[PDB]
Amino acid sequence: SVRGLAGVENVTELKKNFNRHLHFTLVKDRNVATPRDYYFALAHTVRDHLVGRWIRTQQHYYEKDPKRIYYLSLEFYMGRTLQNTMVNLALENACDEATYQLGLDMEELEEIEEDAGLGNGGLGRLAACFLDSMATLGLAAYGYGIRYEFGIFNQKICGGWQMEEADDWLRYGNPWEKARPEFTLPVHFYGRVEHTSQGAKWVDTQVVLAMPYDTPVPGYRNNVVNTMRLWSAKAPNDFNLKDFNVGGYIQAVLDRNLAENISRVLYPNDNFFEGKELRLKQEYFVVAATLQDIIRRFKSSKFGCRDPVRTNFDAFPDKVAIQLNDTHPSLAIPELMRVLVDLERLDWDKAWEVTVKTCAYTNHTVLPEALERWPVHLLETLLPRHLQIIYEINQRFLNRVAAAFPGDVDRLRRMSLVEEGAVKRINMAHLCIAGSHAVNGVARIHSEILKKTIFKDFYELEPHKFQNKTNGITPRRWLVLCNPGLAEIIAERIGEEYISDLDQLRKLLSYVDDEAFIRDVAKVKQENKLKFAAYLEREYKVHINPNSLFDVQVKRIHEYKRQLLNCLHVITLYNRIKKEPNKFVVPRTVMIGGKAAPGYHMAKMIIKLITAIGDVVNHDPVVGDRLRVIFLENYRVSLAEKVIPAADLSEQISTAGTEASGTGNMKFMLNGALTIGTMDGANVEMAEEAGEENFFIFGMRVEDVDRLDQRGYNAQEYYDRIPELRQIIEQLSSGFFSPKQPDLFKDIVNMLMHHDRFKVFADYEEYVKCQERVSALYKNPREWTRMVIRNIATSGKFSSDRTIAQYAREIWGVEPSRQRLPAPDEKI
Amino acid sequence: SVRGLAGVENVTELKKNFNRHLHFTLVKDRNVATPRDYYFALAHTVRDHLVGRWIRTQQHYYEKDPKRIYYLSLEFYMGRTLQNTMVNLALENACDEATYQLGLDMEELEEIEEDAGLGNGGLGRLAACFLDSMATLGLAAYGYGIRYEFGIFNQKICGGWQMEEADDWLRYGNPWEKARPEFTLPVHFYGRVEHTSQGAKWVDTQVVLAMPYDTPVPGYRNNVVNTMRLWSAKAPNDFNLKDFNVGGYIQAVLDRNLAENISRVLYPNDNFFEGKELRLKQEYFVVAATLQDIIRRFKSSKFGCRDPVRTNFDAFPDKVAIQLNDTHPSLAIPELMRVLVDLERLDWDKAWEVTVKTCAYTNHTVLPEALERWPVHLLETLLPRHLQIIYEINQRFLNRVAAAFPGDVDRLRRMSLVEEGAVKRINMAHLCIAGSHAVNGVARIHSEILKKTIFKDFYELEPHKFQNKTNGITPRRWLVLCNPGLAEIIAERIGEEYISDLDQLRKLLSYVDDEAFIRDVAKVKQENKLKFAAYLEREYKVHINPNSLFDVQVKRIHEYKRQLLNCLHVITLYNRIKKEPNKFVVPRTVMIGGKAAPGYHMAKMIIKLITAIGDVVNHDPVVGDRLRVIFLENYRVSLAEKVIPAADLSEQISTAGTEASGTGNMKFMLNGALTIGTMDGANVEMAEEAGEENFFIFGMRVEDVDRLDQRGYNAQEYYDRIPELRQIIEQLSSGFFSPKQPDLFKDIVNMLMHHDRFKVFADYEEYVKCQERVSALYKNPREWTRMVIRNIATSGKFSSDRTIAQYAREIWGVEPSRQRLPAPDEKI
Ligand SMILES: O=P(O)(O)OC[C@H]1O[C@H](O)[C@H](O)[C@@H](O)[C@@H]1O
C-alpha cells in the first residue's frame, strides 16, 4: 500500500533501534518484556525519526522570523499518536516489516497506546485536524492548551446505563511529550488593584506555576514538525507552606493539591456552560501562561538583536496572530490589554489597536445554553484587574455604537458586554467580537444565521469583521490512516498527490462507470465491514451480519442531534416486520454511539432507550437477522477510526439551524457512506458539492422551523395525525420496552409530547419515507456504489488544508507552503 | 586519582552517547541546551552503562534461586545517585575527560542533581549504606519502601528561625528510576471481618493500588546491580467514581487525591512518634504490597516448575529473609499471618513457625517518646483483621510466659503486646520481638542496655534471640566519593584493595611516623578546608578563616544530642576572650547544622539560640577572627559530603545511654577528624579501636547518669557551683543575645534550670576542660596529624561491609561473595 518504501537497509535500521530501546530505555530482556514494554520501544524508535526535523523546524522559524500563529484551545482531541506519525513520515511499511521480523504484529502494539482524549467532540477534533494541516501547509503555528491528567471520561454501559470512569491517560507514561521546565511561568489569581501613580497595580495575588510539555506535530511528508505546548499546574514550593501559616506541615504539603487541580480534569460538557470557578481558572491559566510565552518569542526573536525605540509592540500584529477557538480563551483579550497597559506602560488606544489586529474569534454554535456568560462576582474575586478592563472596553465600545446609532437605546443594551438583572453577567461572545478583527462561523449557513440573527447588531456596526471558513477534516488520519484500502485503490487510478491536494479527488468522476473501479470501491467496503463485525465480537458481543446495511449515528448525545428521531425510525421498522413478518425487508445493523455528559439527564435517559430497544429487537425470533440495534460503547477518536470505514449510511439529522457545521458528516463522505440528513450545517455544502440527487436530504429547512415556531409547534397534531407515530408513543408509555419498570420512559414521552424544542415529530414522516428510499437503493449494489463514487470524488472541499489555507489568507495574513523543508538531522 | 582508566576509546564512547542523548532523549541542540538538559544527557549516558549489569544480575538470581533478603524501611536516605554510580563502575575519570572535551565541567552538572532525601537522619542513611554493602558483597538483596513525592523538607533560616519548604524532588524527572506497572498490586484498607466457614474473610474494603518503581543499586566494582523497589499510591479508576456515588463527577475525579496521598510526604519526625492515621497507612501500604511481591518471586521461582505438595511455605524461611528496620513495618508480622492463614489456608502453628523464622527486627533507640504504640481504635477501623491476629499472637505468647514464669502476674502485664488504661494501645516493639527470630541493637552498649533494661523480660524468656550488629558506614560514598584526596594518598602507600576490605586500613599504622605521610594527610585536610571555606562564600556568606580549627556538630536537632552543651562551651569561649582579649587563643570555626522537626519547639528554639550567639560573636571587633559561630543551613546527604572532609573536630556529645549507635561519628573518623564525645553508642567501640588516648572522651558514663537519677538530678547545684556557668544563664535571662526581645530565651533557661532530662549542666566542667585539651593539641600540628593517622588507620571495623557480613551470617544465614559476576551486556 501507499504506506512508503519498505527497503532492506531501513528495516535493519528500525529492527536495531527497537532492540536498543528494549535494552536501554525499557531496561528489559526479551524473555521478560511486556506488550506495553514492546509498544514503548517502537514508540521511541519512531519518535527518534522526527527529532531531527523538530529541532530543525524550530531553529528555522528562529532564523526566518515568520509571523507565528497561535491556536488556543482548551481542547485538543488528538487520539493516539503512533500510526499517524509513521504515516506522515512514510515509515508505516518499514515499522511493519521490521516488527514482523522481530516476531511482533504492529497492529496489536498500536492498540496498546492510550488516546489523547483532551477534547469533547467536535471543536476538540477540529483543533487536532487544524494542527495537522498547519504543519503540512508549512505554517509557523503553535497549538496551546492544558495538559489534563484526566481527559474525557471512559464510558461503560452497565444495565443499559452509562458509567463514567476516570480517563487516567498518563498512567504508564507518555513517550510523545517533552517537558520544558525552563519555560515555566507564573499565573496570578485573586489579589486586588491599587492605583499607584505610574500604574494600576494588581497586588497580593496567589501564584500558580505553569509547566509546559511539548508534543511534536509532523506535517505530511514535508520535514516540518511544529509544536503543541500544553501547560500543567504546579504549586509554588514556598507559599503553600509559607507565610506565618500554622494550619500543620503535613496538611500544607497536602493542600498543594488544591493548586495543582487547575490542570486535572477536562470539563465533559459538550456544548453546555457550567459557570464553575474551576472552569474560569482553566480559561485564565491557559491564557496567562500562553501570552507570556508569545511575548518571550517576540521580544527575543530578532527584536532582542536590534531592540530600540523602547522595544515595540507596533510590530506585534505583524509578527503574532492568535486564534480563539470559541469563547473559552476570551480572557486573552483583557489579558493582552493588562500586560500592555499595566506592565508595558502603553497608551490604551495604542494597545487596543494592537489587540484587535492580533485577535480573531471562531464561533462554534448558536444553541443559547452553550453560551458563556460569567457572573461579575466571579470576575471580581478571581480576576480584579480583568473586570476593570472589561468595563472600560464596554464603555468605549457602546460609545462607538451610540455614535453610529443615535438615540437607539435598545441597541446599546443589546450590545452591552455586561447583561443586567439579578446576577449581572459578562457575555463573553460580545467581548470576542469587540476586541477582535475577524469573527467567523464554521459553515456558510451558520455564518448566515449569525449575521441575520444573533450577531446582527454587531454585523451592522462592523460588517467587515464577519467571515465564514467552512470546516474540514484531514485526509491523513481520516482516510490514509483509518482506511488504507480505499486510499490504495484511489491512488492506483489517480496517483498519490491527493493526500496533500484533496480536490484532485474530482478525477474519480471519470471512473464512476468503470467496472473494475465500481468493484474495488465495493470490496474494500465489504472487507471494512467484515473487519469491524469481527472486532465487534472479539472486543464485545451480539453477533452482527456483514450483509446488512450498516446504519450509523456516532456523535455526542444531545437532544438537538436527534438521536430520538433515529430511535423512532427503528421502532417503526420493528413494528413493520412484526405485522408483515414474512415480507422481504432490506436488513440493517443500526449502530448508535456517543457519550452523554454527567447529569445531562435526558441524554443519559436516551442511552437507556437505545439499549432498551436493542434488548427487545435483538431477541425477537421473528425479526431474526434482519434488524440488530447496537449501542457503540465509549466512542472516541480511535473508535471513530474503525466504524467510519465500515459505515454504509450516515445519520446526520439535527433539527435545521442547531448544528453549526458538523465534521462527522465529512468523515463519512470521505469513507464511502451515503448521507441521510436535514439541510443543516455543512450538510448543505456537501449536497451542493455531490449534487442533491446523490444525497438523502429530507425534512424541514431552517425556513420551515421558523414558520412553525411563529404558528406554535404543536406535537399533539402529529401524534393524532400519524398512526405509526401514535403506536410508538403508547409502546413507550405502556412499558413495552421496560417491562418490569413501566414508568421508566414516561420522561422521554412527556418532553416529546409537551416540551420538544427540537421538533422530533415534525420531521418523522419525511425521514421514514426518505429512509425507505435509502433501502430501495441498497437493493441495487451497482447504483449504491456509483452514488458512493460521486460523494467520494467530491469531498476535496472538506479538507482542513482548504479551511487552513482560507484562514491563513483572509484572517491571519500568511501564505501556505506545500513544499519540503530539508530536515532531518546530521551525521556530523 | 583511584577514579579508574581514563582511556582513549572510552572517552570517545562517552563523548558520543552524551551527544545522542542531548539530541534523542532531550531533543535539544547545543545552541539551546540548558544545564539541566546537560546533566540529564550525562545521567542517561552513565545509566546506559549499568543496564546490562542489572538485567544480568536479576536474571542470574532467577537461574541460581538464592535465599533473597528484603530490607524494608519507610526510609532510604540515598542522597544523589550520579557520582556514586560512576565510582562504583570505575567511570568517574572518563566521564570527567569526556565532559571536559565537550566543554562542560562535570562537578557543576553533579550539583544540578536533586537529592533523594527519602530519610530523616540516622536509620534513613543506614538503609542506604546497607544497600551499597549488600550489592558489593553479592547478596540477592532488595530494598523496599515508599516512593515519596516529597522527601524531608528543605530548611531555610529566615530571621534566625527555620523555614521548611516542600522537597519537590521529582519536579524535573528522575532518570534513575524505572516504573514497573505489570507488578502493580492492591492494598486493602478498612472493611470488616465475616467468619465464613473455611475462613475468616476480610470484606468490603477500600482498595488503593501500589505502583513500583525500581532504582539500580550497583555493588562496588563487581558487576552486581540489585534493586531498590519503591511503591507509589494510585487510586483505582473505577471506584472513586463508582458505586451509586452521587457527590458530583469533577469532585469524584478530584477526590482521587485523597487515595494517592498515601505516598505523598515523608513524616519529618526523627526519633518521635505521632500516631497519625496517615502514618499507619504508609506502614500498612509498604508492607501489604511488599509481601505480595515476595510470595510472586517465591511461588514462581523454581517452585512454579516443579510445584507440588499444595505449593509449600515450609521452604519459605529458606528462600526468603525480611529485615525490619525499626518497628515501622511491624505490620509484616500479622500481614504474613493473615495471608498464610486466611488466604493460603495454613494452620496457625505452621504459619507462626514460618513467620518467626522469616522475620528479624533491628531496634534503633531507647528514647521512650520515639516508641510506637498505636491505639486499638486506629487498628479497629483501618485494619480489622490485623487487630484480631495481634490479639491471638498476644494471647498465646503470654501463655508461654505464664508457663515459664508461674504466678508472676506483673511480668504478664509487662510483656503484654496490648497496654491498658485509658487509650488501650499496642506496643509494636513487643510484637516485633514476639513474631521474630533475632532482635538486635545497633552498638554493643545499646544492645547491653536492651537486655538489661527495656527488654529484660523478653531476654529472660528468649535470650537466644538477642544480638548486636554494630553499625557501619560505606567506604565508597563516605571516603572515595566525598574525599578522593585522602583515598589517593592512602592507596599510594597501601593499595586499592581497601575500598572493599577496609580493615586493611590498619596498615597505615606503619606510617604513623612517616614524614611524607604526615605531610600528605595534613595537606589534604588544608585543601579540603580551603575548598569548603570558598563554597561557603560562593553559596552563602560570613567569611571564615581556613587556619582555624573547624569544630563541627552536624546531626538532627534534638535535646539528647546536646547541641545546647556545645552552645554553652561557645558562650564560655567568647566570655573568656572578652576578659582577657589580648591573650592567644587557638582560633576556631564552630559549625552547627541540623534540622528540627515541624513543631518540636525546643529544637526550633535551639536553632534560634545558635544564630543569636553567631550574630553577637561574629561582630565583636575584639573577637576578630578568633571565633566565628556558623549555623549550617539545610544539612543533608550531599552537604555532609562537603563538610565531613573539611572537619577537624567532631562533636559527639549525647548524654550517655540515649544515642543508640551514631554513624555521623564513624564518617568523621574516616575522614580525619578527632572526636570529642561521651562514652556512648558506637563511640565506645571507636575509642577502644583507636585507643582511648587517641580520643577525647569526657563526662558521665551510663553508670553515673543513673547514680545521679537515684539521688535526683539538681541543676541548681551546678549553677551556684560554677561561676562560668552562672554568668551564661543570666546573659540568656537578661536578654544579652536577644537585645530587643529579652524574654526570648527564658524558655531554654527554664528547662535547663528546671526540666532537663539530659543533664546538660552535669557534663559542662568536664567538657570545657576536655575541649581545652583539644586546642593544646591543635597547637602542635605534627602530633594532631599523628593522632588523626591512628583514628583513620583504625576505622576498618566501621564499614557497613562488616555490619552486613555479620547480619548475613548470624541472622540471615547466607554467605557474602566478594567476587565479580561477569556482566554487562552482549554484542549479539
Ligand atoms: O519555541 P521555543 O518555545 O523557544 O522552544 C523551541 C524547541 O527547542 C527544541 O527543538 C525542542 O525540541 C523543542 O521541544 C522546542 O519546541
Ligand SMILES: O=P(O)(O)OC[C@H]1O[C@H](O)[C@H](O)[C@@H](O)[C@@H]1O
Ligand atoms: O525481580 P522482578 O521483580 O521480577 O523484576 C526483575 C527485573 O527485570 C529487568 O532487568 C529490569 O531491569 C529490572 O528493573 C527488574 O528489576
Ligand SMILES: *Cc1c(COP(=O)(O)O)cnc(C)c1O
Ligand atoms: C469528528 C468527531 C466528532 C464530531 O462529530 P459530529 O458528528 O460532527 O458531531 C465528535 N466526536 C468524535 C470522537 C469525532 O471523531
Ligand SMILES: *Cc1c(COP(=O)(O)O)cnc(C)c1O
Ligand atoms: C550520617 C548522617 C546522619 C547520622 O548522624 P548522627 O550524627 O549519627 O546522628 C544524619 N543525617 C545525615 C544527613 C547524615 O548523613
